């Protein structure tokens with residue numbers, strides 16, 4: 001009703017667990033937005049947790065977080081709509097798959113912005129827990145916007161499987177970022193078999209094992225950073241701030 005009156009639909013962006021993300025245009029302001037539509041059971045524990053994650057994520061304000069506009073409910077069927085910024089340059093996934101790894105200046109900047117975003121999220125006492133390239137978006141100016149926290153997951157620090165830590169502390173996101181930065185640093189992995197094996201070989205308990213064509217004079221710094229992020233022991237991963245301040249990262 002409000003969704004159909006105020007917006008025009010343009011494009012399916014995604015399908016999650018129980019919901020869709022639709023690219024829409026607002027009739028009044030003429031701007032494109034991404035709207036997530038979640039069918040919801042009102043008065044269920046699932047719902048009341050979702051409403052909590054909405055109150056919590058609505059309070060995030062950072063240049064590297066997808067910008068939040070609006071949340072509302074519509075009516076023997078119920079929908080939750082969440083209106084966010086539409087990011088014109090799609091996902092980090094598309095950018096990795098399109099040969100990001102050959103642009104060392106660019107991928108070092110994008111890595112830094114992801115860190116900016118994680119540092120802010122961690123400073124606010126929150127954890128993403130679902131960090132992966134399809135959940136990092138790129139705006140028209142090629143800046144990182146993190147989103148898709150997941151409304152059914154607790155993001156309060158104090159309370160697909162290839163990005164998940166052996167384990168819930170702040171340090172789960174930084175393990176994930178170690179997998180992500182390897183994919184940013186390495187050639188697009190055409191096949192599923194290559195993807196799963198190469199990444200399972202990083203996540204190997206007995207120290208991260210890199211492919212034969214990464215053990216190079218070229219990818220020395222990148223190797224250090226990832227090895228640090230991918231430590232089995234969470235207490236031995238750096239904080240986003242600790243890494244940001246490190247002189248492993250090239251100049252901004």
Ligand SMILES: COc1ncc(Cl)cc1S(=O)(=O)Nc1ccc(F)c(C#Cc2cnc(N)nc2)c1F
Nearest residue numbers: 034035036054057068082084086087090147148149
């Ligand atoms: C900061 O995140 C939040 N903040 C506050 C709250 Cl209330 C919820 C969240 S959320 O974590 O549920 N994210 C979320 C929710 C809804 C969405 F439509 C999107 C999107 C997108 C998108 C996809 N493709 C392209 N190209 N551009 C943009 C999203 F990311």
